[PDB]
Amino acid sequence: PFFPPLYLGGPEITTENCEREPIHIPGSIQPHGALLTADGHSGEVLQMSLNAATFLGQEPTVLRGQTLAALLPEQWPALQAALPPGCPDALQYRATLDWPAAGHLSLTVHRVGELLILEFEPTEAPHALRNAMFALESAPNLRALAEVATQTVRELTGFDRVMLYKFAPDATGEVIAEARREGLHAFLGHRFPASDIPAQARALYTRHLLRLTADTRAAAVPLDPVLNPQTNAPTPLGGAVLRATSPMHMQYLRNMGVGSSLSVSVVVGGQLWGLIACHHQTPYVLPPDLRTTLEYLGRLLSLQVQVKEALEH
Amino acid sequence: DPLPFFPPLYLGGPEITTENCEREPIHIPGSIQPHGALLTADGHSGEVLQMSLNAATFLGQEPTVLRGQTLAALLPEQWPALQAALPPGCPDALQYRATLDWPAAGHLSLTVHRVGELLILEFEPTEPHALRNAMFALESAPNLRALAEVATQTVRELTGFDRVMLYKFAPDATGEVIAEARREGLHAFLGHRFPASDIPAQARALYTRHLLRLTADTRAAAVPLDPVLNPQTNAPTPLGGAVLRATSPMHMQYLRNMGVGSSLSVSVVVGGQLWGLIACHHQTPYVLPPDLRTTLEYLGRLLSLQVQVKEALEH
Numbered sequence A: 001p002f003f004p005p006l007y008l009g010g011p012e013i014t015t016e017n018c019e020r021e022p023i024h025i026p027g028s029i030q031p032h033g034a035l036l037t038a039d040g041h042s043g044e045v046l047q048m049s050l051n052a053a054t055f056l057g058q059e060p061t062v063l064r065g066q067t068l069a070a071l072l073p074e075q076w077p078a079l080q081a082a083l084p085p086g087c088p089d090a091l092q093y094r095a096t097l098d099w100p101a102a103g104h105l106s107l108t109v110h111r112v113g114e115l116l117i118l119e120f121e122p123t124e125a126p127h128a129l130r131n132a133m134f135a136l137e138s139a140p141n142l143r144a145l146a147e148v149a150t151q152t153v154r155e156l157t158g159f160d161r162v163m164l165y166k167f168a169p170d171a172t173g174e175v176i177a178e179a180r181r182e183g184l185h186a187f188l189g190h191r192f193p194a195s196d197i198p199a200q201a202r203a204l205y206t207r208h209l210l211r212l213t214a215d216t217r218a219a220a221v222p223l224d225p226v227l228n229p230q231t232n233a234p235t236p237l238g239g240a241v242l243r244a245t246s247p248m249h250m251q252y253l254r255n256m257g258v259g260s261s262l263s264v265s266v267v268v269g270g271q272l273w274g275l276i277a278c279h280h281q282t283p284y285v286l287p288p289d290l291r292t293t294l295e296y297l298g299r300l301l302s303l304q305v306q307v308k309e310a311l312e313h
Numbered sequence B: 001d002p003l004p005f006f007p008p009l010y011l012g013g014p015e016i017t018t019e020n021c022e023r024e025p026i027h028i029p030g031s032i033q034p035h036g037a038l039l040t041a042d043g044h045s046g047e048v049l050q051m052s053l054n055a056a057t058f059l060g061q062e063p064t065v066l067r068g069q070t071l072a073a074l075l076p077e078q079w080p081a082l083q084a085a086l087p088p089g090c091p092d093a094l095q096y097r098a099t100l101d102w103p104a105a106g107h108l109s110l111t112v113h114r115v116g117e118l119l120i121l122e123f124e125p126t127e128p129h130a131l132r133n134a135m136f137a138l139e140s141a142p143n144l145r146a147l148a149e150v151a152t153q154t155v156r157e158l159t160g161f162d163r164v165m166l167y168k169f170a171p172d173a174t175g176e177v178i179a180e181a182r183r184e185g186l187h188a189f190l191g192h193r194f195p196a197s198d199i200p201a202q203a204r205a206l207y208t209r210h211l212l213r214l215t216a217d218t219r220a221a222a223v224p225l226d227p228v229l230n231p232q233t234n235a236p237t238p239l240g241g242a243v244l245r246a247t248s249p250m251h252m253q254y255l256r257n258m259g260v261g262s263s264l265s266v267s268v269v270v271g272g273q274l275w276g277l278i279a280c281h282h283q284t285p286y287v288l289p290p291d292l293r294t295t296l297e298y299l300g301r302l303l304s305l306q307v308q309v310k311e312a313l314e315h
């Protein structure tokens, strides 16, 4: 099973119970964005991140009464149609708001049962993706495909280290390709225990294909209330990229000297084949539109891995 | 019966009939569609060899001036990028794309690929979260039918085409429309089946490697290359990989007779085989700009993946 989260007086997480930390329900988010939850029917704002006032520019109480209808007039009917009752928690809808306080915000919404989860992040506003797609497809074998993928991602993102991280049948990990800035340790060829990414984290990565720690030293921002009014239970946040990252993992990142981290799941035959894994030495908020490019690349790599593995077997 | 290609018309080959169909060399027509321009150049020196006859009007230069310069001089910023992206021996399927600001012609999209020692350069005029939203909707579709319907509707919304169908090949190469989105008033092709010869075997081979072909105006005359043969080889210039390549007069006659002014289709490739087509029709001529066509190319790949996934959920 899982332990209760901390804020419901569950045990603190150690190396004896890695598998049981409830990473989906941390009750908090990373501070480079803001999150609101809301009722599926009424559009009634039920929870907000204590930092919402910053991003939205709204007097705190104003929000926690109001309706999405009021708050987002153009958007609220689109949401209603895009995310019908009963849809999967994996389905997401995005829009760009030109919002008074903040030039442009990206809005990302998904639905978990009766709750809409809304994420707001700063945003903005060429051929590198098309060029990359053809490059991946003409790679002659899996090894070269891995090399092209890591190089392409590094060029698109500027990340200090990009790795292709392949799982063995027992969930032992192996770095099979790597693109990195001069003057970093090489992780190419190295193998790591299964417990470095515990079973409960791997299952959630099979369904929700991208996550990130924008700053491995930033404090999480609580949800208020912490419990969902609807259920008097924790809000599931696994489908939210703003989710506060496990402290266990943040400690691992810090011990490696990483300041920003991000990964993309490569899913083949319904299973987690590997990850595109990105390190930055310093804090780094990759903007939403560039993340989208990596999300596309994730799908394309999933296709090409199967194609390429089929021409060996 | 499968038989080798006839020589093209310009090398004294025969004209094509419903009989000899499967032997038309559709990949070497010696000509392009008039909404863009094409140059060929030597892959090592960058000497310009062939150009479409309309090139002066896209590129704003006399032929003899174009042909008298190397790509190093014509494309000083792109020439080194081309050479890195398209190394000798690379496959003909690999494409490099850039946007140019050309004085006379505005923003041009440049698409380049390499066939042996030849570079092929295509120039076309070029111009929010719809793709991301579509990607997730496709993935959440519960079964093959719902996927097919979401895919057709999405493509129609992105493009404005009068008709978007999902055409699926059977094992005998006969095809069947299994989903479609269509303009009000058009008659339905849903569930109709068409014989295998409607897309003869050499087209289906070419459609497995080069994943998008189109016909922007079913009545437009083709524009010859000049000279027609590659001076490197005194042989035909391979245009299988060029979207500007002229369409077969057989298929163009087949389209006009249906009342179609514009045609476009994307291959859906599963396990190395052509599974089916995203085929689109417009009643009037219609040019879809290169950046919009890129969205369809990306959806072609997504759909190939999702078709595998939906079919595996099915035994």
Ligand SMILES: *C/C=C1/C(=C/c2[nH]c(/C=C3[NH+]=C(/C=C4\NC(=O)C(C=C)=C4C)C(C)=C\3CCC(=O)O)c(CCC(=O)O)c2C)NC(=O)[C@H]1C
Residues within 6 Å of the ligand: A014, A015, A016, A017, A018, A019, A021, A023, A173, A187, A192, A195, A196, A197, A198, A201, A211, A212, A213, A244, A245, A246, A248, A249, A252, A261, A262, A263, A275, A277, A278
């Ligand atoms: C109690 C168990 C511990 C544990 C937990 C844990 N680990 C993650 C997530 C990740 N761990 C990763 C491991 C590596 N990244 C690398 O670059 C290398 C090699 C150089 C390794 C071995 C990765 C890639 C992830 C995914 C997240 C990311 O992209 O950075 C979680 C879940 C994190 C979250 O979603 O909040 C958890 C709970 N880690 C340990 O080391 C043990 C002691």
Ligand SMILES: *C/C=C1/C(=C/c2[nH]c(/C=C3[NH+]=C(/C=C4\NC(=O)C(C=C)=C4C)C(C)=C\3CCC(=O)O)c(CCC(=O)O)c2C)NC(=O)[C@H]1C
Residues within 6 Å of the ligand: B017, B018, B019, B020, B021, B022, B024, B026, B175, B189, B194, B195, B197, B198, B199, B200, B203, B213, B214, B215, B246, B247, B248, B250, B251, B254, B263, B264, B265, B277, B279, B280
């Ligand atoms: C002598 C042979 C004939 C022949 C040849 C032929 N057909 C194509 C290409 C296509 N034919 C298609 C057929 C259909 N389109 C539809 O909408 C329907 C049904 C509603 C059918 C049956 C399609 C979709 C294509 C692909 C191209 C496109 O989508 O526009 C070629 C190749 C053309 C080229 O690439 O230059 C050839 C040689 N077709 C016949 O009907 C016989 C008489």
